[PDB]
Design a protein around this ligand. Sequence first.
Ligand code: HEM
Ligand code: HEM
Ligand code: CL
Ligand code: OH
Ligand code: OH
Lengths: 150, 150
Amino acid sequence: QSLQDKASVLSGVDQAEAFAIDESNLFDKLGLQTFINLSTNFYTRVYDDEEEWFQSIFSNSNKEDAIQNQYEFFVQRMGGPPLYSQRKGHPALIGRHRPFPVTHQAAERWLEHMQNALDDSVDIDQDSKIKMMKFFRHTAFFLVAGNELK
Amino acid sequence: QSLQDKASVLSGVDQAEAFAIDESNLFDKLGLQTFINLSTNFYTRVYDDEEEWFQSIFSNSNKEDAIQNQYEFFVQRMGGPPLYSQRKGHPALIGRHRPFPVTHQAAERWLEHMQNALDDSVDIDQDSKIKMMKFFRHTAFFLVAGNELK
Ligand code: HEM
Ligand code: HEM
Ligand SMILES: [Cl-]
Ligand SMILES: [O-]
Ligand SMILES: [O-]
């Protein structure tokens, strides 16, 4: 059974829905600043999280560096310039999450913070929010599936 | 030490040179058919390889499916439509190579076949060949670095 199928079964979202982001250019629609704002909001919530089991996953990471890694990845993957690879090479999401305990429960907590970040946004329309959360949700469970094999 | 830095040290190519592919659109320059031809040539060489230690790495894989996975990934990453993700989701190269013994020596053998495939091409110019092999070489050693941690 493939990683992507495991993600689809766990998450309620398959790759086809998760990658509906690719049907139009979201970077062109939303703009770079919108991504920076989303990631900054998300990571503010992460680093303020009172649940130590989740907070402490990010303890070896600087918040500002994490914000940059995230929005540069989102920008690159959602139709914008490839800033992430210029700096860091392949996204390699399963490989890069290897050090962290990416459990089913951690996925839901990540996605809670991100939903709250999307709810706080001004410059993201409803169609875009739906497509982005399908992408995020499928991806989070893809990482869960990758975590299970390491 | 990061995966990308380990790749750079091993390979003689850093991420900056490896991702010079992103400076212009190679898909626009070369066209889809050129990619299909390259991957078909490459994989013909792989599956005809008399060295069992290398050949047998690909024994659980169908040749035609492998050709499709490769060129769809190259097309997606080198400026073309995102065919790979439509079908399979994230490239996740480290995760997807987890089942295979991706050693330093296997990297060099892979890159031997690919060089021979590039040498056989008609529709790839010298500037493009240089950029593609920098990308491939850095990537192969990135996978070596990922292999070392699994
Ligand atoms: C499933 C629960 C998740 C957990 C617990 C988690 C945890 C982490 C942690 C601790 C980092 C290191 C922070 C940094 O230094 O940048 C990280 C990095 C990253 N995460 Fe996640 N993550 C999760 C899901 C996701 C999802 C759903 C995506 C994309 C949609 C994603 C994309 C990334 C990216 C692009 C990086 C930067 C990698 C790097 O450059 O080092 N993660 N994650
Ligand atoms: C380092 C030595 C390498 C070895 C021994 C190796 C081996 C393999 C094998 C056995 C597969 C499965 C064939 C399939 O079912 O598609 C595979 C898949 C793949 N490889 Fe490699 N590989 C290497 C390097 C690379 C490099 C340098 C790249 C990209 C530049 C790459 C990209 C891929 C892609 C995109 C797939 C398809 C993954 C999938 O969809 O399952 N590989 N590789
Ligand atoms: Cl990966
Ligand atoms: O993350
Ligand atoms: O490969």
